[PDB]
Design a protein around this ligand. Sequence first.
Ligand SMILES: NC(=O)c1ccc[n+]([C@@H]2O[C@H](COP(=O)([O-])OP(=O)(O)OC[C@H]3O[C@@H](n4cnc5c(N)ncnc54)[C@H](OP(=O)(O)O)[C@@H]3O)[C@@H](O)[C@H]2O)c1
Ligand SMILES: NC(=O)c1ccc[n+]([C@@H]2O[C@H](COP(=O)([O-])OP(=O)(O)OC[C@H]3O[C@@H](n4cnc5c(N)ncnc54)[C@H](OP(=O)(O)O)[C@@H]3O)[C@@H](O)[C@H]2O)c1
Lengths: 660, 662
Amino acid sequence: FSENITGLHLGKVALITGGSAGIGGQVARLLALAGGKVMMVARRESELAVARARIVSELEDIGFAGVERRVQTLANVDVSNFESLKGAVDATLKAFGRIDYLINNAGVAGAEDMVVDMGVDAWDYTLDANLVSNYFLMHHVAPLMKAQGSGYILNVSSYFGGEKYLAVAYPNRADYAVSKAGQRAMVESMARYLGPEVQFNAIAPGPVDGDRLSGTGGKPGLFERRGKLILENKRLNAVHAAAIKAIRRGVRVEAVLARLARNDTVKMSHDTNNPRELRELALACAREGDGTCTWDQYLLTPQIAAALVSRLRQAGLFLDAPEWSERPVTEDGDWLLRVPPEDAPFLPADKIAAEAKKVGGGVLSKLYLGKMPTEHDVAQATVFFLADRAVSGETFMPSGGLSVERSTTERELFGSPKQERLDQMRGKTVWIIGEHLVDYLAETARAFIEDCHAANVVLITRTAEGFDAVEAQLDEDVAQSLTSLVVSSDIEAAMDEALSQWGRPTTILSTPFTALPGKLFEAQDPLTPDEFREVVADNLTHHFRVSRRASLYDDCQLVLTSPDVAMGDKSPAFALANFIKTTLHAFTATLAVENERLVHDVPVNQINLTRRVQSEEPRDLDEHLEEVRRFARAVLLVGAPLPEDSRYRARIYRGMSMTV
Amino acid sequence: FSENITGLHLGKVALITGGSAGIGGQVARLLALAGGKVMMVARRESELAVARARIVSELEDIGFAGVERRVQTLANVDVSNFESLKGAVDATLKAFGRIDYLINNAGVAGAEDMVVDMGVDAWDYTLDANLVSNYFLMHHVAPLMKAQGSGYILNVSSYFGGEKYLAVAYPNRADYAVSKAGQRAMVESMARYLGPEVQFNAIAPGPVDGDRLSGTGGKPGLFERRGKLILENKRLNAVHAAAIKAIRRGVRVEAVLARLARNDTVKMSHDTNNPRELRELALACAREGDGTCTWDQYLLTPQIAAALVSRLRQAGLFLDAPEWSERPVTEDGDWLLRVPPEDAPFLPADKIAAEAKKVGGGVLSKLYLGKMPTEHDVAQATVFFLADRAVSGETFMPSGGLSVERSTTERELFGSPKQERLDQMRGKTVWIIGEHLVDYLAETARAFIEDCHAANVVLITRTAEGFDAVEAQLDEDVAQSLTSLVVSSDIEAAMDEALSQWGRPTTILSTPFTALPGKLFEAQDPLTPDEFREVVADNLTHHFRVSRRASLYDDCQLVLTSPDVAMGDKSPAFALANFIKTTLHAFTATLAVENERLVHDVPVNQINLTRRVQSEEPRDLDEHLEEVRRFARAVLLVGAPLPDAEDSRYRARIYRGMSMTV
Ligand SMILES: NC(=O)c1ccc[n+]([C@@H]2O[C@H](COP(=O)([O-])OP(=O)(O)OC[C@H]3O[C@@H](n4cnc5c(N)ncnc54)[C@H](OP(=O)(O)O)[C@@H]3O)[C@@H](O)[C@H]2O)c1
Ligand SMILES: NC(=O)c1ccc[n+]([C@@H]2O[C@H](COP(=O)([O-])OP(=O)(O)OC[C@H]3O[C@@H](n4cnc5c(N)ncnc54)[C@H](OP(=O)(O)O)[C@@H]3O)[C@@H](O)[C@H]2O)c1
């Protein structure tokens, strides 16, 4: 095979990010063997030098001449650092005089945290490294490809980013799932604008047999890594649920934490003073041990204890607690009276190996081809696909025939709920977050106040003027139930403030503060990488920031809104709205599953203000008014307290994406 | 060095149907140049020998040895003749000792007729040649591939068969679109059973630049062919629409036909004898001429006149017409008083070119890559795809980035029709076609009679016993509104009889008479090609045969039901149900668009009794009874008189061509 493809890519120049190991390293090798010139870029010089030396050796044995000039490297290229990516494009043009193929391969694992535990800096790092970097490179390279008459951009996505019309939940990995869904959504929505010169496709492999999944240099594999994270999250969620259940029946949060602080399962289990939830928790913990590990003797590590206290604080459960209201956030890891010893593992290696084979068996049983493809197999497929000239706007699936069955698919709404369900909103508080969508925000505020009899709608805006524009659309009697909160720092602080001032909401509607831009690849005025980064911030990160608070509120429903497009617009705004709809659905689907494992059990659903087909968009004022009214009906459908009456019914109100 | 890609397919053996020209011929060529051994099969020996000679000559140049033995042919292999296909497999094994790749490439264009004009034999020819032929070959080669531990089956589909979760309408081509959708649906639903040894994928190119599309030797190009058939259908549809509007106003059908038989635009335009609909028709026809063609002077050719009378007869409009009911069907082309002259064209060359440019422009404007791919470009993509070892169950799209925007996704049902809309069923007649689905047919009969106040539910069955079982589930007071009609010849005859006895229905629910088989590729008891052909007859052709009559009924709504699976079943029935859902959706989407062009304007929607996710299927009695009730609500949603485009453009579109899963 590897000596007999010299004709496939002869003279083609490829820039490969993360080109030193894994799939990227195999693609670099096979492109070279197929006669291509490669610029391999990555952070570490040592892996890059060894990988390049091995490829150049093989090129010699095949009988290439001038081997040293066919394969080049640039180290210290971090896909989260845009300046270093511009350096990679400049080095490729200096070595080779052109770029034919851009392979967006580099990907980080990301935060590996439930959304309620994930940091904004960790989320931003994952989205910058995995998604915004790809747009950065396309921005710089696509014009060179269009000027020479040809090029190919390939995004390396994942099966866990979903497929066209079918989102997938990836619990504990929402930042990663969104970033991978984003890579594919870019291909689906932007390939139109890269044509006719540039092909733009994605690959979506699932788990891949090589050193990183296997485990290399003392380090455990990805199935084992996921298994360990599942057990950590199970213990956090179980201690968290006990504390919340105790607080819900009126145990003081200081009394729960004072008793958790003693961090002794034996004592807590047999102590009469401890609330029943904590007694039961400690009994259950005490039965889970193996004889070496410590988790049967201690409830918490400092790390899990820090995550527990942050969840309680974020839910507003410290607002009336003397000590805890003022304690510095920097001491969240320091409140346990005793801690597991450094000498022994917290988690039992048998329960880790069992969770790891449940994860593995789960994927392995869904492969049509019976075995996980190797890195070589995925690289081979990639190099074959790069030779085709008739495909654009598609995601190839070199996954082993991986088929995870799910019913999480964008639906067009035409249906309603019972006035009895709506009458449960009477006297309740709801939050609407928004700015530019005045007609939609006003009709929703009207529906909640006038049709559902909510006592208070807190309209959280970027500016006072945004409030005034919505208030001016309501009758004076309806506006009497509209409260203004203008963001002064960040949305989480505005949500913390709304909660402390006016109480716990029953419904939170999240809408973007800013309209989409009307540009993408136009030579005159293109969307710059910074502007695209801001689109991601305003339409994806914004929802994550609202979601990470909302998911901690008892008896609350969360509704996420994807972007509108102005009537009669013919710009790439429509393509950007469909990019957001797809990418946000990965978030909605994943968060809906994570929230069902949390004691707060918050339903999450998505409403879309842009249709799939641009000619079906509203085209006159009657159709606009129909859509505004349908939007408010969809918010009430997924935002009013949910009616299990049925296994089918229960699935249909978590993680849905509904278009109006 | 520059031409060496032998690493991709050295020593792999391919059988390619339609291997002598077009995409198939270029696939055979590029597989051979990539080191593959090929058995090219087709009808004509002469074309096969030229194709084989050119490949063998091109091999010898780029320096292969043992070259004549690497490329073999078998003539007289026709995908509509299953014995000849078995021969092709035996010849591949004789020549090369194994088969690695099966390329299901041969296909026919099919009937090129609207559903309401298409013959059952034309439909059956298309499905046998394009779809059942692929299963026939899969049935014979899959066990060979499983026994050697590896293989690849590639179905050559079309972009106009749609894509996963997104059907596409292909008006005038419903037989072809179903066959192409079927090729893809086999990949999506059966790859699990061909694994782990066998990769099973499709390709779905759009229009492909080569001899076939351009046309040669005075034979029209595909765009020009589609253009002329659009003009012929537009004239048939316009004459038919004028006739129907005249009959609706109360002009006797014998009167309308006596005037049409004069076949003279100028006299019809001016004569006051003539109903307003025919005068306006004649005036429009009279202004469409180019000075050469005759369609401005005659309304009809014998062919269009035969198609018109067939539409009127099948709508029951001859039931009270003495001369016409008794006319033999043989004479449907013989009733014009004058026919266009044989030497001059009926249709104007200029409007054909303008319809062909309109079809061409619509396609080209939707290509991301700006240019239609060549045959060579599609074949090259195919040969690169066949070297991959990690893809199964996918459709590749070497189309030039062809993107036709539509909103035909399959959806789960959570909907609400207003009681006001359901109340328009009061006093109306409904037809339910079925046999095996007793609980669903009974709850649907009960919903129409008790919740919607229909006067009459005609339950059209295969047997009296099937009627007796539905009737036994109903209260005596509901059962009073249930009428039995047992099929005695075919479903079309049973519909004509139901119409003649009990009048025009408001809703027709089509359900398959037979349950799906519980097998597919099992070595012990596989689904044979004949059994698979009966699945196609019972679950696709069945709905075609109902739809062809229903689509001619004023103020009727048509509902097509895809298969159920028995609770607890773990067989390939579930995969067959999903194969049918996808394939039937191509029919549903295409028929909804054709019917809007017809004067009758019959809505068509699909309801699916099987979910996409097997763990989501009903697991106990309670979940079964819930699904049964939800099915009957779904039939009411799409079966009651629908929303007008005038009321809402959005809502009008939702209720036409949908596929809804309960
Ligand atoms: N492996 C799987 O199971 C799997 C499954 C589905 C999808 N994928 C996708 O496949 C792609 C390749 O993953 P892999 O598992 O083959 O990777 P891997 O073996 O970890 O190799 C990653 C390569 O990327 C480089 N890299 C890592 N972080 C980087 C950063 N911040 N900036 C620049 N380069 C970086 C590495 O070198 P340095 O560390 O020196 O930078 C190395 O060259 C990713 O896009 C991933 O999401 C992988
Ligand atoms: N070309 C397009 O525009 C286009 C677009 C989308 C999809 N497709 C699909 O692409 C495939 C290839 O079509 P093409 O356009 O390349 O076809 P084509 O140019 O007509 O090629 C015909 C080849 O098939 C053979 N053939 C024809 N009828 C046959 C029959 N009944 N049984 C066996 N062999 C037969 C022909 O030889 P004999 O006549 O000697 O039998 C010849 O070898 C078909 O599946 C079609 O649905 C084509």
